[PDB]
């Protein structure tokens, strides 16, 4: 627990070192602001266009042209600006559907990674998920997905089953590993060698059916104390 | 022929090159039209042989820059243009890039050009390379061996 | 599941009037529409290339297959890539690539990640899901035999491990007969890959409607502008060219807007494809009818020109 806690504080302490050095790490939520700020300035600067009329300003063509002719160029500028306003909301409606689809992805993630444990492999971060910690943001959400990654691996000789007393033996939890001239049981995600007993194995049928089965003894824990 | 000139054969004014064709046209046809209303071939009104009209060389110009804060060297890429017709020359599938050296050292993709080729800064000159997908790791598979880790590291990955 | 589309880029001058001198001086008073439309199309082009990297480049290390291709009676020769053919794809992906196949200022941009690199990502994921099980998706690759790997697949769905070790030769023969009948039923069916085809055919139908749309007269005298400038006065024909220009610019932006919905459709399908790559192949999913109909055991991804195929 002293090793797990210092590995956790060193991992959560390097996040401020990683996000301050990488200035483009928070680029993904800022393009939401930058695309909207560029779209409104596009909508503002579109009024400088004349749209094929005499002028871009509409007050002077009401003052220069006669109303039998001036409403022709006004209807050109109105239909040009109404098409400019209709397209701007339509590009906003496609973008708001993308953010809402991202919001339900953010809503299902805090419902599954924060409030509970999800067993999916790359949903709440890369690796075996343990827990997570969300953080606030001006226009989004930042998740600190705490994961479990193995390290310091080692190869071992394995076997699918063990024949003993004319009977096969299959483990309840874990598999059989070996050094050579000995055989022990351990779990999958961690190395913890234990002496093979009847407490963690079960017998089902004979042993000459399983392909590649090895012969070894199984120490019954109720045998030496009773004798 | 074989030059980008203005053609005008009883009307139909435009710009395009003239090349010799191979099809056998019917004698009453005057000008042929391709799909989606584009003029493909107009026969000569004087010498009565047929010639295709191909439009001029066009395409997008993409300027690959690494940023003004680092350097001022750029590399121009003509999209879909074979630059046999209009300082190092590299031709890719998307187009031929002018102004970047091609190296065999495959690295990570910094600037996406296209067709599995990316550009980055050497540090001095702009380079061109095939994208490195990752390091090769052939796992020693065996039907009598297993790998089980002895320790573990806890990692906290961020998301926005 | 479809992943990406055809990244298209449209020019302004050749689409509206097709190499004319009148358009270069007359289109500049319209504003900055030509900046706005190419921001949207190149905004699609970096987006759809991001989706294929989010699906196929989920692994970091390229795993290679061992030369001893024996996995306890199982046969994976139809999914592992062929060293004999230079394309380095399997038998199914060669059937997948041959079943589906595919100016006026409209150009086509090729994708960045080419099809042999998607096949090399498919070969790396197939080598990882066979030699390691769940360890290559959660961290470092641990070597494990396939007979004991299927015992991990069997123990997760609730059956205890003695059933596999007594009937391993029957399960290995049942799976090899099933995977041999997959490509027989895929080639005999005519509309099995119709989802990737309708993505291709709709984008083909959008651009041919776009180039037919310039042939419309737009209420004017003719659709070609050389006859308009020659038959009328340039102040008299300026109302006719502006009738055409706003008609073609609305025609191009309507093509842009529906392409933005279809790009948002397939990107949402590509994020659906990105999890279905992760939970089915890189792990094991305890859902009901997600990685195939029934209790999920394993999955094998295959390459595609503009999509992804999972053998659940
Ligand atoms: C086990 O790992 C060690 C250390 O890398 C290596 O020398 C040895 O050859 C490996 N044995 C097998 C059977 O893979
Ligand atoms: C495996 O190696 C030797 C074999 O003689 C044995 O002494 C040792 O205790 C074994 N390892 C473990 C962890 O039991
Ligand atoms: C036009 O005159 C030239 C030279 O006399 C001749 O070669 C050509 O065939 C003539 N074309 C027609 C249509 O008579
Ligand atoms: C260039 O880089 C320096 C160092 O990071 C920074 O202070 C400066 O603001 C940058 N200038 C521009 C124009 O980005
Ligand atoms: C491009 O130009 C080179 C140089 O002339 C030529 O060899 C090559 O065939 C051309 N490619 C195409 C597709 O025309
Ligand atoms: C890449 O390899 C080829 C083939 O050996 C060689 O001709 C070329 O000079 C190499 N390029 C570089 C930049 O090393
Ligand atoms: C294990 O693999 C080797 C090499 O592929 C093979 O010769 C041997 O027969 C296999 N053993 C079993 C029990 O499958
Ligand atoms: C796998 O199938 C191929 C094709 O029929 C065959 O040649 C090969 O022997 C098979 N391998 C096994 C282990 O069944």
- Secondary structure of chain C as H, E, C letters: CECCCCEEEECCHHHHCCCCCCHHHHCHHHCCHHHHHHHHHHHHHHHHHHHHHHHHCCCCCEEECCCCCCCCCCCCCCCCCCCCCCCCCCHHHHHHHHHCCCCCCEEEECCCCCHHHHHHHHHHHHHHHHHCCCHHHHCCCCCCCHHHHHHHHHHHCCCCCHHHHHCHHHHHHHHHHHHHHHHHHHHHCCCCCHHHHHHHHHHHHHHHHHHHCCCCCCCCCCCCHHHHHHHCCCCCCHHHHHHHHHHHHHHHHHHHHHHHHHHHHHHHHHHHHHHHHHHHCCCCCCCCCECECCCCCCCEEECCCCECEEEC
Distance separating alpha carbons of residues A73 and A62, to the nearest angstrom: 9
Residues whose CB is less than 8 angstroms from the CB of residue C59 and which lie 6 or more positions away in sequence, other chains included: B134, C121, C124, C125, C128, C136, C137, C282
Question: CB distance C138–A128 less than 8 Å?
Answer: yes
Residues whose CB is less than 8 angstroms from the CB of residue B52 and which lie 6 or more positions away in sequence, other chains included: B18, B19, B20, B21, B40, B41
DSSP at A46: G
Technique used by the depositors: cryo-EM
Taken in order C79, C83, C86, C88, is the CA torsion positive or negative?
Answer: positive
Question: Hey, is B141 helix, strand or coil?
Answer: coil
**Radius of gyration (Cα) for chain B, nearest Å?**
27
The tokens of B110 are what?
């910094």
Q: What are phi and psi of C119, to 5 degrees?
A: -70, -30
- Distance (angstroms) between ligand 4 centre and the Cα of A25 equals 17
Cβ of B136: how many Cβ atoms within 10 Å? 10
The tokens of C305 are what?
């020109």
Bridge partners (DSSP) listed for residue B52:
B19, B41
The tokens of C150 are what?
């299927």
DSSP string, A115-184: SS----TTSSSSSEEEEEEEE--SSS-EEEEEEEEEES--EEE-BS-EEETTEEEEESSSEEEESSS-EE
Atom of ligand 7 minimally distant from the CA of B144: 1
Name the closest-CA residue to atom 8, ligand 8: C75
The tokens of B131 are what?
């994208």
- Distance (angstroms) between ligand 8 centre and the Cα of C308 equals 26
Query: Among A155, A176, A181, A182, which is best to mutate for testing ligand 2, by the most ligand atoms less than 8 A from CB?
Result: A182
Whether B131 contacts B104, CB under 8 Å: no
For strand B75-79 and strand B89-91, is the pairing parallel, antiparallel, or unpaired? unpaired
Q: After which residues is chain C broken (C to N over 2.5 A)?
A: 102
Question: CB distance C19–B140 less than 8 Å?
Answer: no
- CB of A137 within 8 Å of a chain B CB? The answer is yes
Q: Which has the closest alpha carbon to C274: C11, C56, C39? A: C56
Pocket of ligand 6 from Cβ distances under 6 Å: B 103-104
When CB atoms are compared, the residue of A7, A11, A142 closest to B159 is A142
Residues whose CB is less than 8 angstroms from the CB of residue B59 and which lie 6 or more positions away in sequence, other chains included: B78, B79, B80, B81, B95, C107
Residue C50: closest C-alpha in chain B: B112
Q: Which has the closest alpha carbon to C54: C278, C291, C290? A: C278
Distance separating alpha carbons of residues C78 and C157, to the nearest angstrom: 26
Question: CB distance A91–C134 less than 8 Å?
Answer: no
Query: Among A157, A176, A179, A193, which is best to mutate for testing ligand 2, by the most ligand atoms less than 8 A from CB?
Result: A179
When CB atoms are compared, the residue of A90, A97, A155 closest to C264 is A97
Cα distances (Å, whole numbers) of residue A193 to A175, A182, A186, C132: 10, 11, 5, 21
Helix-strand-coil split of chain B, %, nearest 5: 0, 45, 55
Distance separating alpha carbons of residues B22 and B111, to the nearest angstrom: 44
Distance separating alpha carbons of residues A219 and A196, to the nearest angstrom: 6
User: What is the distance, to the nearest Å, from the Cα of residue C295 to the centroid of all Cα atoms in its chain?
Assistant: 27
Distance separating alpha carbons of residues A47 and A45, to the nearest angstrom: 5
Distance separating alpha carbons of residues A105 and A31, to the nearest angstrom: 18
Q: Which has the closest alpha carbon to C282: C147, C139, C79, C165? A: C139
The tokens of C113 are what?
């990640």
Distance separating alpha carbons of residues C161 and C169, to the nearest angstrom: 15
- Distance (angstroms) between ligand 1 centre and the Cα of A155 equals 6
Cβ of C79: how many Cβ atoms within 10 Å? 21
First to last CA, chain B: 60
Distance separating alpha carbons of residues A21 and B158, to the nearest angstrom: 14
Distance separating alpha carbons of residues A19 and C142, to the nearest angstrom: 32
Indicate the length of chain C as a whole number: 312
Distance separating alpha carbons of residues C166 and C306, to the nearest angstrom: 42
Instruction: Find out whether the beta carbon of C216 lies less than 6 Å from any atom of ligand 8.
Output: no
Distance separating alpha carbons of residues B92 and C114, to the nearest angstrom: 12
The tokens of A28 are what?
């993904």
Interface chains of chain C (3 or more CB pairs under 8 Å): A, B
Question: CB distance A52–C250 less than 8 Å?
Answer: no
DSSP at A111: I
Question: Hey, is B84 helix, strand or coil?
Answer: coil
- Of the listed ligands, the closest to the CA of A153 is 1
Distance separating alpha carbons of residues B38 and B23, to the nearest angstrom: 18
Mutate to test the interface with B, among A12, A102, A125 (most CBs of B within 10 A): A125
Residues whose CB is less than 8 angstroms from the CB of residue C69 and which lie 6 or more positions away in sequence, other chains included: C76, C77, C80
CB environment B81-110: b (16+ within 10 A), e (fewer) = beeeeeeeebebebbbbbbbeeeeeeeebe
DSSP at B116: T
Question: CB distance B115–C112 less than 8 Å?
Answer: yes
The tokens of A223 are what?
């045998």
Exposure of C93 in the CB half-sphere (CA atoms within 13 A): 28
Helix-strand-coil split of chain A, %, nearest 5: 45, 20, 35
Kind plus residue range of the DSSP H or E element containing A20: helix A15-21
* C18-C23-C27 Cα angle (round to 5): 125
Q: Which has the closest alpha carbon to A209: C169, C151, C174, C172? A: C169
Torsion of the alpha carbons at C182, C183, C184 and C190, rounded to the nearest 10: 100
Residue appearing with tokens 């080692």: A154
Question: CB distance A49–C29 less than 8 Å?
Answer: yes
Residue appearing with tokens 């939401």: A32
Torsion of the alpha carbons at B78, B84, B87 and B90, rounded to the nearest 10: 70
* A194-A196-A197 Cα angle (round to 5): 120
Residues whose CB is less than 8 angstroms from the CB of residue C306 and which lie 6 or more positions away in sequence, other chains included: C2, C3, C4, C5, C6, C196, C199, C200
Cβ of C258: how many Cβ atoms within 10 Å? 12
Whether C263 contacts C48, CB under 8 Å: yes
- Of the listed ligands, the closest to the CA of A21 is 4
Q: Which has the closest alpha carbon to C273: C310, C246, C304, C223? A: C310
Question: CB distance B146–C148 less than 8 Å?
Answer: yes
Residue A155: closest C-alpha in chain B: B147
């Amino acid at each position: 627990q002293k090793l797990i806690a210092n590995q956790f504080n060193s991992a959560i302490g390097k996040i401020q070192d990683s996000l301050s050095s990488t200035a483009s790490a928070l680029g993904k939520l800022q393009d939401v602001v930058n695309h909207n700020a560029q779209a409104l300035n596009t909508l503002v600067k579109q009024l400088s266009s004349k749209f094929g009329a005499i002028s871009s300003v509409l007050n002077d063509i009401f003052s220069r042209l006669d109303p039998p002719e001036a409403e022709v160029q006004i209807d050109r500028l109105i239909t040009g600006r109404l098409q400019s306003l209709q397209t701007y909301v339509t590009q906003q409606l496609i973008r708001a559907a993308e953010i809402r689809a991202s919001a339900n992805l953010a809503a299902t993630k805090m419902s599954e990674c924060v409030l509970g444990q999800s067993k999916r492999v790359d949903f709440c971060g890369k690796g075996y998920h343990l827990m997570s910690f969300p953080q606030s943001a001006p226009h989004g959400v930042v998740f600190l997905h705490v994961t479990y990654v193995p390290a310091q691996e080692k190869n071992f000789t394995t076997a699918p089953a063990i024949c003993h007393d004319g009977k096969a033996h299959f483990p309840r939890e874990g598999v059989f590993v070996s050094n050579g001239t000995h055989w022990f049981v351990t779990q999958r995600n961690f190395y913890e060698p234990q002496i093979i007993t009847t407490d963690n194995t079960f017998v089902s049928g004979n042993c000459d059916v399983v392909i590649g089965i090895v012969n070894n003894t199984v120490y019954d824990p109720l045998q030496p104390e009773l004798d | 022929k074989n030059k980008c000139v203005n053609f005008n054969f009883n009307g139909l004014k435009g710009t395009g090159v003239l090349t010799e064709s191979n099809k056998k046209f019917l004698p009453f046809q005057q000008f042929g039209r391709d799909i989606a209303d584009t003029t493909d071939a107009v026969r000569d009104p004087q010498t009565l042989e047929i010639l295709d009209i191909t439009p001029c060389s066009f395409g997008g110009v993409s300027v690959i820059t690494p940023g003004t804060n680092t350097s001022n060297q750029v590399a121009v890429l003509y999209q879909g243009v074979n630059c046999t017709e209009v300082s190092n020359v590299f031709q890719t599938r998307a187009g031929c890039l002018i102004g970047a050296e091609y190296v065999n050292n495959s690295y990570e993709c910094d600037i996406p050009i296209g067709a599995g080729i990316c550009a980055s800064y050497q540090t001095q000159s702009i380079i061109a390379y095939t994208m490195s997908l990752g390091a090769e790791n052939s796992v020693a598979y065996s039907n009598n061996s297993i790998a089980i880790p002895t320790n573990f590291t806890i990692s906290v990955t961020t998301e926005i | 599941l479809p992943v990406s589309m055809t990244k298209t880029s449209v020019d302004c001058t050749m689409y509206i009037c097709g190499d004319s001198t009148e358009c270069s001086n007359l289109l500049l008073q319209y504003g900055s529409f030509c900046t706005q439309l190419k921001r949207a199309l190149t905004g699609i082009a970096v987006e759809q290339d991001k989706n294929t990297q989010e699906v196929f480049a989920q692994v970091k290390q390229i795993y290679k297959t061992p030369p001893i291709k024996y996995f306890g009676g199982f046969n994976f020769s139809q999914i592992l890539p062929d060293p004999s053919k230079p394309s380095k794809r399997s038998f199914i992906e060669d059937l997948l690539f041959n079943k589906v196949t595919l100016f006026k200022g409209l150009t086509v941009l090729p994708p960045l990640l080419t099809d042999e690199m998607i096949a090399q990502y498919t070969s790396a994921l197939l080598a990882g899901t066979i030699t390691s099980g769940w360890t290559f998706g959660a961290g470092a690759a641990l070597q494990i035999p396939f007979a004991m790997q299927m015992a991990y697949r069997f123990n997760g769905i609730g059956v205890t491990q003695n059933v596999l070790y007594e009937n391993q030769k029957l399960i290995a023969n049942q799976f090899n007969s099933a995977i041999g009948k997959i490509q027989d039923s895929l080639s005999s069916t005519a509309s099995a890959l119709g989802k990737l085809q309708d993505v291709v055919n709709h984008n083909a139908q959008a651009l041919n409607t776009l180039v037919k749309q310039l042939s419309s007269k737009f209420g004017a005298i003719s659709s070609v502008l050389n006859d308009i400038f020659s038959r009328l006065d340039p102040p008299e024909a300026e109302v006719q060219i502006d009738r055409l220009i706003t008609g073609r610019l609305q025609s191009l932006q309507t093509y842009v807007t529906q392409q933005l919905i279809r790009a948002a459709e397939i990107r949402a399908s590509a994020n659906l494809a990105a999890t279905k790559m992760s939970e089915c192949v890189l792990g094991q999913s305890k859902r009901v009818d997600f990685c195939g109909k029934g209790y999920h055991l394993m999955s094998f991804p295959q390459s595609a020109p503009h999509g992804v195929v999972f053998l659940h």
